[PDB]
Amino acid sequence: DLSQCDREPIHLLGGIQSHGVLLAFRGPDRLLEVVSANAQALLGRPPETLLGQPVGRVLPAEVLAQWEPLVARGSVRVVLPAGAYRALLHESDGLTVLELEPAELQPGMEETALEVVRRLVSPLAGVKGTQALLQTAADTVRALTGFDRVMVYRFDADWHGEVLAESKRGGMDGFLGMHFPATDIPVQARALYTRNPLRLIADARARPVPLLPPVVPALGRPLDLSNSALRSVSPVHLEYLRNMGVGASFSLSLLKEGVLWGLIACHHLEPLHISHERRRACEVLTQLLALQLSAEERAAEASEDAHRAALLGQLATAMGEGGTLEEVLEKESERVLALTGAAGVALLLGEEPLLVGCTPAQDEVEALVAWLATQPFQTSFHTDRLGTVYPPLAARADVAAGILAVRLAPAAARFAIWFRPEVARTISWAGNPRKPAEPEPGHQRLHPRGSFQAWEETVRDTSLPWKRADLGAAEGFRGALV
Amino acid sequence: DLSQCDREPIHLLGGIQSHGVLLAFRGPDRLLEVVSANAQALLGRPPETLLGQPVGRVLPAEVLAQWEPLVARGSVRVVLPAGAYRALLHESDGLTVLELEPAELQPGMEETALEVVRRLVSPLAGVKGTQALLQTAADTVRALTGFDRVMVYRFDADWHGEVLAESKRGGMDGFLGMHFPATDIPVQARALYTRNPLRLIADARARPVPLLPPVVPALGRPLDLSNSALRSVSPVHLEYLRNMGVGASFSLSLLKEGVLWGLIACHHLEPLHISHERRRACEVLTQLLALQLSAEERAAEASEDAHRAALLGQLATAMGEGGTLEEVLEKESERVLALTGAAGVALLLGEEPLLVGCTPAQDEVEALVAWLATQPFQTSFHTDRLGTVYPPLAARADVAAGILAVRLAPAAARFAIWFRPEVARTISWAGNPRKPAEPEPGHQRLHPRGSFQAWEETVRDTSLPWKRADLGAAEGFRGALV
Ligand SMILES: C=CC1=C(C)/C(=C/c2[nH]c(/C=C3N=C(/C=C4\NC(=O)C(C)=C4C=C)C(C)=C\3CCC(=O)O)c(CCC(=O)O)c2C)NC1=O
Ligand SMILES: C=CC1=C(C)/C(=C/c2[nH]c(/C=C3N=C(/C=C4\NC(=O)C(C)=C4C=C)C(C)=C\3CCC(=O)O)c(CCC(=O)O)c2C)NC1=O
């Protein structure tokens, strides 16, 4: 339901955060086209007067002095009478956007940055699980930033999330282990955070600073702030932070292999600015964790295939030890079941269902089986909530919540089918998930939920999901039973 | 071990490098037990007059002031009359070793390392090969250190090596593509360089500074300088470097999944000293490269298994369909050879052999078959130098330099054998690999070779090696064939 939450144009809200100043210039003269309403505090003149002027008549010589590395390298530290500032240049809507926010003052920031970086490479990580991997990343972002709480947030396949790891001050409330609606981060935001992987909300109570004029005159809409570091966020989201007790918020996108794996979310009870130089040091940590997780995941899946393939080879040696169909399956029952991590297996080598292990009754097999041939799957069909797909068996989640069947013949319907029983899982949603928002009457005004306390839910009638190794093992068993 | 090369106790040579000072204290009084002979250059008093004195009376006040963080963190910057120094503590032979070394002078050093760390962690690495991954490792290590030439050196299975990548300042000889004998880095060095990942030789012309006494009086041998940043290196190597025309040398160990994969080797035409803190920055880069290589490599091998398994998946459909064995083993011939990257396959499934593709003649295969049935292998056997283990086919490197064989039956001689042809290769050694050293008459003193000029060698009668995927595919195919 592409609803109110997904429709807000969070890049065209036309305001910025108060700790910074934004200028935008057009054309060969670099004439001031747009300017934030608070620019007097740095430029010494009312912003209204500066509109339309050449850039040499607007910026101080300090900033203009560093224009070329600004343009080349994208950012420079300038020292102005007001103090040390970071200047950030990008292009948006055919304008040259210039943003100025307070520079990093801690001289040894990069030295400490390099030290935590060492902690996230080390010899080997994940040494007691990729769990210890996330906990290090959480602890190092928190060491580097000073945020009262830091959490590693992963997306599920339906874009809801759970906090997997957490590093926070003593006496802080936590969120470790809970799940959050997919609508807490709607579709257009995930889209943006796939492009722009950083965001600081320095003070969740502050007023947003408007831009002048409110529309880019040639465009008829406000300036696109997709890449702005000062961009003020959805007012819906500010209300969510305050409903949470949060005063400052800083988050970074974990992009694993081009996709949006999750987030590193940081909370501070009080307003808190983090310099751009230091936000970029944190970005290095998140790219490093994304690298550590790919290499451990790929190593785990290799070890998985190695175990399955040893099983397959032990099955081959068995069959190659005497003309003996239904009996070697009987004699190698665990290996046929562990092939795909199953609890039973129906083998339709044609005649009668040969039922091994923990299986439904014979009739129920054939009925499941008749129904299977009429499906548009090539060599294999798999599911974890069978009963959703076939309620003739919805009451047998004791033995067949999930199934994995490979077609043993092209035409005709010989099958091997592995069965899995349900595993009940309790999950703690952070708030009642049936009511994730609060609409006013008329439904044109949405609000975040008011509560986040654990709202608990047990899931039934779904099995453990069929992993990639289970599928590959199934393909191989089919390879040797033809 | 073989050569006298392997016998040199390079950790007990008894000297340090002249740009630093080493001091070793024993026992609760921190009495001075061992000190380098140049220690007056930083302490005022004659070193021998200091042996047997408490630490409090021998060290300058500047060093003593920093004593507690030095004991805690194990490294510390102190400002001495002779300049800024880095102080390091380690333990060796029941003594507390203190080494002094000139410190880093560029205050923006770590900001520079943090930027190049971004270059190397950057997602979408290797998107023009692991080869472009290595080139970036050389280029950034060269950027961070300023050496005239930085090379990337990979060890082969016999521990000879080749330079896979190279970054060097313009107008300088290179070594890209060349190979170097295993004896160039002898066995005790490879062992030491596994557990000690850095070495700096700052001045290849300099004489070492001796320790006093020449032995630890308790032990009757020199102080173990294994973990010493100032250790003076084997004179045979110092001669090697001078023969190479190198004035300073610095190298780092590439450790990948715990074993010594190779080195990043740095040469300077002139003496040059890298700070400890800058050396530790380069170490960050190498653990990065190691990590980038593991994820890329396990990515490649998983992509490979995927193609093999798709071949296997399509073989299984060809079976379980029309006809006999040899029938389908004739349309799918291209897949059967492809399974293992091979130009031929012989199939012994009962009658005469089934020869598919480019194979040696039926009598030769029958002769090879009977010899295979008497060898200590369980299901698979493979080689890439068939002729040097089976001379009957040494002449047939045109069709059978490599074989890969699987048993399709236990106590029986049922086999699938894949053949490969020779693939000739032109190695360029850095000098004559038959004379990799110039020994003196009576063979008591060795010297490195005099020349490193390109020296060609062609390797015949060897096939392309059998990779994990090849082996994996073969076993899976045996799975299919009862
Ligand atoms: C650990 C748990 C946790 C979650 C799940 C979380 C959600 C979350 N919501 C966000 C933004 C957002 N949330 C919303 C909208 C909504 N949000 C709602 O709950 C409903 C009511 C709507 C809409 C009807 C929008 C539009 C943004 C984008 C803010 C912006 O970039 O403008 C962000 C990015 C901004 C930031 O880092 O603070 C996060 C991390 N924050 C956390 O700490
Ligand atoms: C371009 C490729 C390339 C190679 C292959 C190379 C070899 C090499 N030899 C080394 C050490 C060494 N080499 C030797 C010994 C020998 N060496 C000989 O050729 C024979 C004569 C002996 C002995 C019989 C020893 C003993 C060491 C250990 C040095 C030490 O740490 O004390 C080292 C480590 C120290 C350093 O980085 O300088 C390298 C890199 N250097 C390069 O740049």
Author numbering:
A (entry chain B), B (entry chain A): 9 to 490
From the study:
Phytochromes are red/far-red light receptor enzymes that were originally discovered in plants, with homologs in bacteria and fungi. BphPs share a typical domain architecture comprising three conserved domains (PAS–GAF–PHY) known as the photosensory core module (PCM) and a C-terminal effector domain with enzymatic activity, usually a histidine kinase (HisK). BphPs sense red/far-red light and display a reversible photocycle triggered by the Z-to-E isomerization of a central chromophore, biliverdin (BV). This isomerization results in the formation of distinct states called Pr and Pfr (red and far-red light-absorbing states, respectively). Most notable is the conformational change of a stretch of amino-acid residues called the sensory tongue that transitions from a β-strand in the Pr state to a an α-helical conformation in the Pfr state. S. aurantiaca harbors two BphPs, SaBphP1 and SaBphP2, that bind BV and share similar domain compositions. Full-length phytochromes are challenging to crystallize, but the PCM, lacking the effector domain, forms crystals that diffract to 2 Å resolution and beyond. In the Pr state, Phe460 is buried close to the hydrophobic environment of ring D, stabilizing the Pr state.
In these experiments, bacterial proteins with different functions were investigated. Microcrystals of photoactive yellow protein (PYP), a blue-light photoreceptor from Halorhodospira halophila, were used to explore the capability of microsecond X-ray pulses. A nitrite-reducing enzyme, cytochrome c nitrite reductase (ccNiR) from Shewanella oneidensis, was exploited to investigate potential secondary radiation damage, caused by 90 µs pulses, at heme centers. Finally, a first TR-SSX experiment was performed on the photosensory core module (PCM) of a bacterial phytochrome from the nonphotosynthetic myxobacterium Stigmatella aurantiaca.
